[PDB]
Amino acid sequence: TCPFYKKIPGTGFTVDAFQYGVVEGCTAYFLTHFHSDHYAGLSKHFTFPVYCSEITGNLLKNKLHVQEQYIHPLPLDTECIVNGVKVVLLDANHCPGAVMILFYLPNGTVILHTGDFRADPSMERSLLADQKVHMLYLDTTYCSPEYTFPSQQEVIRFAINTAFEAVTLNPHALVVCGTYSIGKEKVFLAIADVLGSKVGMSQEKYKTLQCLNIPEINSLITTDMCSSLVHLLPMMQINFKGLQSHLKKCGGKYNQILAFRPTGWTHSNKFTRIADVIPQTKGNISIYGIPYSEHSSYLEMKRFVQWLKPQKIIPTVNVGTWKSRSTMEKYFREWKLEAGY
């Protein structure tokens, strides 16, 4: 049954709640972003209104075959009325098409649901700045001080410089990047751009990328692998066996693989600077784990909440254990006492 933290009080609305069958009293189902833990349950047989971004609605129609009459895309940064309630969708700085949702309840309460997000000071100057928020449904993925990671910009600089160096030294090296969902497209796009190549991929993955309104995409991606020296593969194939097998398939065009696994966090973050990251190597294959995150770090999350000053916080991640819940609640109290709200 639907958990409480997916229900918006005083409305007929739920958020990211498609795997519970028909939710009692739900008149509109919101979807923050097209990641499987959030869309789980949608298909061509869904007949209730779904409210989402334009990008998310492209992916629902083309990838899951949801019928067009039940998709309600909304523009960003625009006041809209849904079943008698004012809502705004804001950019979440997560994956393409990901939003945060502001609900203006009939009784004067204002609620922000962050979906999944990477907090940023740029958010302090959206339509959030203009009114008080009473309740915050917060992406608490990395809500503990051990979770530090670099800026996205520093990680992309590392990747571009590493790839460019390797292929200039050996023009017969192939670069491979892992993927299993939308998000983190800058990794493979930035590498292809520095090398003057398109990114090659499966037909399924090309289809997914064509849904995302990325400018000049026909210019950066392709299904012709033979013409590309940056290849995208499923994340599960980014290991020595799977990469040896792929190299076999390229027919002696290449004699070395440099592969990238964009992870969120890994404990090598608590000790090592991005400058200092090294690969795992076996023979002519090297694998780099790079800490490219599309969730808030602890410090980024703290700064956002201390700026927003909500009256109540409802965590949406790590809610299944008492030890996690208690940890989280202790940090929320610290933040409130330090800032004075």
Q: Which residues bind Ni ion (CB under 5 A)?
A: 35, 116
How far is residue 104's CA from residue 111's CA, in Å, rounded to a whole number?
A: 7
> Measured from the CB atom, is 119 or 167 closer to Ni ion?
119
- Minimum separation from the CB atom of position 298 to Ni ion (A): 18
DSSP count for the chain of H helices, then E strands: 8, 18
Cβ of residue 225: shortest distance to Ni ion, in angstroms? 28
Query: What separation, in Å, do the N-terminal and C-terminal C-alpha atoms of the chain show?
Result: 35
- Considering the complex, what minimum distance in angstroms separates the CB of residue 212 from Ni ion? 15
* CB of 116 or CB of 185, closer to Ni ion: 116
The residue length of the chain stands at 341
Minimum distance from residue 219 beta carbon to Ni ion (Å): 27
Cβ atoms within 10 Å of 172's Cβ, excluding its own: 11
Cβ closest to Ni ion, residue 38 vs residue 198: 38
| Tokens 């076999």 found at | 248
Environment class of residue 292 by beta-carbon count within 10 Å: exposed (0-12), middle (13-18) or buried (19+)? buried
- The least CB distance from residue 116 to Ni ion, in Å, is 4
- Other Cβ atoms less than 10 A from the Cβ of 72: the count is 15
Nearest to Ni ion of 114, 197 (CB atom):
114
Residue 278 zone, left/alpha/beta (φ > 0; ψ -120 to 50; rest): beta
Pairing of strands 280-282, 285-290: antiparallel
Question: In the complex with Ni ion, which residue's Cβ is closer, 116 or 300?
Answer: 116
Is 71 in a helix, a strand, or coil? strand
Q: Which two tokens stand for residue 129?
A: 């700045």
Q: Which is nearer to Ni ion, 35 or 246 (CB)?
A: 35
| CB of 245 vs Ni ion, minimal distance in Å | 30
